[PDB]
Symmetry: D3
Subunit: 264 residues, 6 copies
């Protein structure tokens, strides 16, 4: 079909309750039952010769829709561009400054907190967002207090990193060992291959890959990691492994969301 | 029978090496930009992002453009008294646009075509374009003088305005319009909403604070009867918009 | 009838606020207007029109915003511009101060097309800020921009007198108005026969490549001060009616 | 001799820049000046003095910065103020635009004491910004603020005519100068015999508690326009000499 | 003595080479030999009934001076106020916004990078600074690139958290067990008692202490942790334990600084 | 023989419960604010922070004030062409001051006395005070109308200026002065520096860009012979400053 030609993506994403496919009256009705909302947050950045530039957004989005569906949580629109400053020496990377992302998060949370949302669960696909997100939460809490927003004291934000789930790390170790690496990992590439089997990329991977975890300026990054991979053999990925990572991430983060939303 | 061949690509479904190859033949990129805001009793909160994203995909598919990820939240401050609206400040959106365009300009992109679904974004976007040009000059980005941004508003296309007037007349209105709701019904037939619509609807175009807005427009509609929308009409709006914006994109990217 | 804020005492502004909540700001720009045009053109037009509207309506007229969003003209010497982000914070500051005192109808009489997008962005920023601050009248505060050069009567007279030679910048209509206001500062300079048509505006460096003498499509040699008085009187009449329709609306 | 930037073409500014790198900005404020003082006082004084200095020196005079840092006066209706942070970004924008064109001696003729600290902060911010941007003339760019009310001759005449009744705000010297410039706008209003002495300025709410009619220590009833002309002529002479010593220094 | 009445502090702090006790010519001479600089970073925040409001700054400062002395590193002036937004419901807490701290770090690093410093080792005493600091580094790298600062590509920042040293955690476990907690910990209080034996505080500690690690708004924080402690029995601290923590932290972070400054 | 009794306390050496008790009797707090900047061939980079911090400690010790932690980096942009200078932008320092004062004002502090060692901080600090008052009003902080900030510059004390003129005459100068270097020698006798000082020193008070500053003042001095400094002179400056600022603090905190 002309409009809808990513069928695996559509099966995974168009489940549960998306904010974008709801009316304001439906959101008002939802808010009688729950004050929780899930934001998928990723990145638009290089993922080596074979990785999708959207990998982090693709992963977060797909898992978030799954968690929404499993928990009854409303799922907001995906934050597609985050803090990816160190990947800007590769073309197609888009990044905000940390200071810009903090203001974006502040704006999102303030609008929704005024409506009565108080449990904000960010399902994150990009390690580089973690620090800025946590900073943004702190900035946001102080802003809500300064505004004397009615529910300010109740408003809570948490980031859940799908790639830090214990079930996910344990499977990646079992399948890929010390070739999982830190960026353009076979686990995340596996997941993208499951969501978008039509976009599986064929490209050579140099047989030696730069290792280590050191990340400074964009210019330094590309010198250290010339093809953009850190330590990783994404050629071990399969869409079958991808489904496994999807199912583990959704199960573990459904429990995590429910523990969050049900906590005081 | 027919085949389906897509000219362009989603940035998100491309590798850095595919982007590099692309920049050898073109310096253009399309961004769909919408909004997450109330659209009345029957309208999707995502309407403007859905319309932008679908049209932008169609234009990419007909022209060869790389299409970037959808900017899903925009300048919707006057809609914040209805739950589910998310808005950036204008000042925040200026810095987001500045950040997007600076990163891609450094890579050699120079023609940024924003396909917009929300009239509230227009002023802030144009302001962002001016701010960005001056920033690119300040940083002495190698291609700064060649970098061009344009906003194309699907709902201002002459063929769209004309078809809306034929189909809906004075019941098109200004917000939660049957033409935009019709497009969302075509795109997502299984998300078509049923709710009551009061027969009298507040008219006029005056928009100030969020709290004033909800008093003037109690259900969220401005002048509109989105109950007139059909997915069949939707397909006509899609086609008209994609044609016109495909020609617009190509006229822009090939201009000096 | 009308008063310049600058020529009023605070006690007079207090007395004014018992009878009206409206204030007019002239907003222009400091930018090149071709070989014969004044760098202050947009400020001059806006200031003079706003004074006349004040006189006709009894409105209080604030001080002229002389520097606006003119970034695309900075490749010509004498241009002064704010960043859009700066002008947003300027407008937010102006309106917050005056909203706190009781003003709630802000009518910006604008002389520069480059300001419009940034002003509309500034309005939206300002409404959310007044709500954040819980300013007493926040919900009633309204801002409107009125562009003298988009008045129906002004556009019509421009089209009748100059046709396609009006163009988009350094226009004979605005130059005519400035000749009327400052007959001592009427400029004579060469005007190359060739002038770029089209409306494309990007970086400042690109703008001067496209529009080498600073004009966009215009023949400002057609301007006379007699035409200038007609534009003045027309803009004052139409924006006097616009101001009153605004301040009396709900 | 001197030219208003607003009444010049870009070609005239280009010709000017072959002979001089200097520009004068009048900077004032929009704020209460007691029962008899004009809200535009500081702008009016600065604008008029700067015009006269331009005439005497051949300097180009930029458009008047009409709204400055007047936050402590916002409990009185009609005050307009920028935040210091906003005024910093305004000055940075002005000077960056003009430095790029070749201007390198920026002489700010100031009418409001409240601006001084923010202007000096703005200068320092601006120098670092021009260095960050590697603007061609960055190292040569200099800004100076000249406060007409701190001119030695002005202070002296004020002390001779008014003594201790000069005070610190809504002063007879500044009011005299405004009567001279706008004889049509001379105000009459009651002036309570009691007026607070002392110089303490904190929040806007505290300021109006301390200075209930807006005056600080002043008897502006002493002002005449004849005194106003003396202050005008003195400020023009001293700041004409100050401008020339500035533009000719290394 | 009248001017100098904190003698243990002075013995620990006035060693090695402090930037503040150097001329510009001495700094120029230093830069021929090394491009590294240590910043102590702490916080000004409540530390329970018995903890010093300066604890995080006191700890970072004292350890940084020790590391400077052991390594030959120049030690910059202490960043006394950081990101402590969640402690503001207790009087005497001072905090920056994350966005403000990012600009502070950007300004410090830009000035020093222009002079030729390229290895910035932040010895941190406050967990709440970590996210904002990492964000600030990223913002700073992109700023240095935008400025085309001569050494931009070489400039590296790292944060080293004294309380996350493996030798420190291992001693705290051995001495305090599960009464170490997360805030106003006996380990950090022990360290302050060693640096400032004259400022040892006597105050009652409620025998039950709120546990858990959840931190949201300042208002929520004080409800959760009424005396300001998280999980901790700082009454187990002694100045003798303090010396041990000081010596372990200096040894481990001297190795960490040397590994950092000597790395490519 | 003599005893030493200190009236006030360092905020850093106090508990939150001691601060609460203190706020029952006083709403005053002192901040030492200095700078990290070159001070010529013989001057400490920390001079302004050292002088502020020592004087502020002395004032606390004589008056009962709580003294906050030293603001060690200030507005020193014109000193950045000499290595070891650290400066905030004025705009950054405004937000730092705003953040400090907002947090402490919410706790009930209302008299903020800044003991300053660097003339370059004065303009930015005064600007910060105005910005902060407006911010406190915007936030409707309970004590906003009572919050007062003052800057006291030790080097502008009448008794300090007078003693400097007696001791050093026209060789005091404007930067890296013998009076400030003398105070640092008294405070830190073991950090006294020996380096050559050219007998001719550039005079005048003109300060613009950092690069201009180094051309005008090649060794960093403005008009000064800091070789005249002794720690004995230092003690006199310390004593004079602490007396005058102790009276200043008490006059401020007890004023309406
Ligand atoms: Cl982190
Ligand atoms: Ni990834
Ligand atoms: Ni819409
Ligand atoms: Ni014009
Ligand atoms: Ni005045
Ligand atoms: Ni701690
Ligand atoms: Ni000094």
């Amino acid at each position: 079909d002309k409009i809808h030609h990513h069928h695996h993506h559509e099966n995974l994403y168009f489940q549960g309750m998306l904010l974008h496919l709801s009316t304001w009256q439906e959101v008002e009705a939802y808010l009688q039952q729950s004050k929780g909302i899930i934001f998928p947050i990723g990145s638009t950045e290089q993922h080596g010769p074979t990785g999708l530039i959207g990998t982090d957004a693709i992963c977060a989005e797909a898992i978030a829709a799954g968690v929404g569906d499993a928990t009854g949580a409303i799922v907001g629109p995906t934050i597609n561009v985050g803090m990816a400053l160190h990947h800007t020496a590769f073309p197609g990377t888009i990044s905000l400054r940390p200071s810009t992302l903090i203001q974006v998060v502040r704006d999102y949370v303030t609008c929704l907190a005024k409506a009565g949302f108080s449990k904000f669960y960010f399902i994150n696909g990009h390690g580089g967002n973690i620090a800025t997100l946590k900073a943004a939460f702190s900035e946001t809490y102080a802003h809500l207090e300064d505004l004397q927003i009615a529910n300010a004291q109740q408003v809570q934000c948490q980031v859940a990193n799908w790639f830090m789930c214990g079930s996910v790390y344990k499977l990646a170790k079992e399948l890929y060992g010390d070739q999982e690496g830190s960026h353009a990992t076979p686990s995340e590439v596996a997941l993208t291959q499951y969501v978008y089997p039509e976009a599986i990329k064929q490209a050579p991977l140099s047989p030696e890959v730069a290792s280590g975890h050191r990340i400074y300026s964009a210019a330094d990054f590309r010198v250290r990691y010339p093809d953009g991979r850190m330590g990783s053999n994404p050629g071990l990925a399969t869409p079958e492994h991808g489904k496994q990572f999807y199912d583990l991430a959704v199960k573990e983060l459904s429990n995590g969301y429910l523990e969050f939303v049900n906590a005081d």
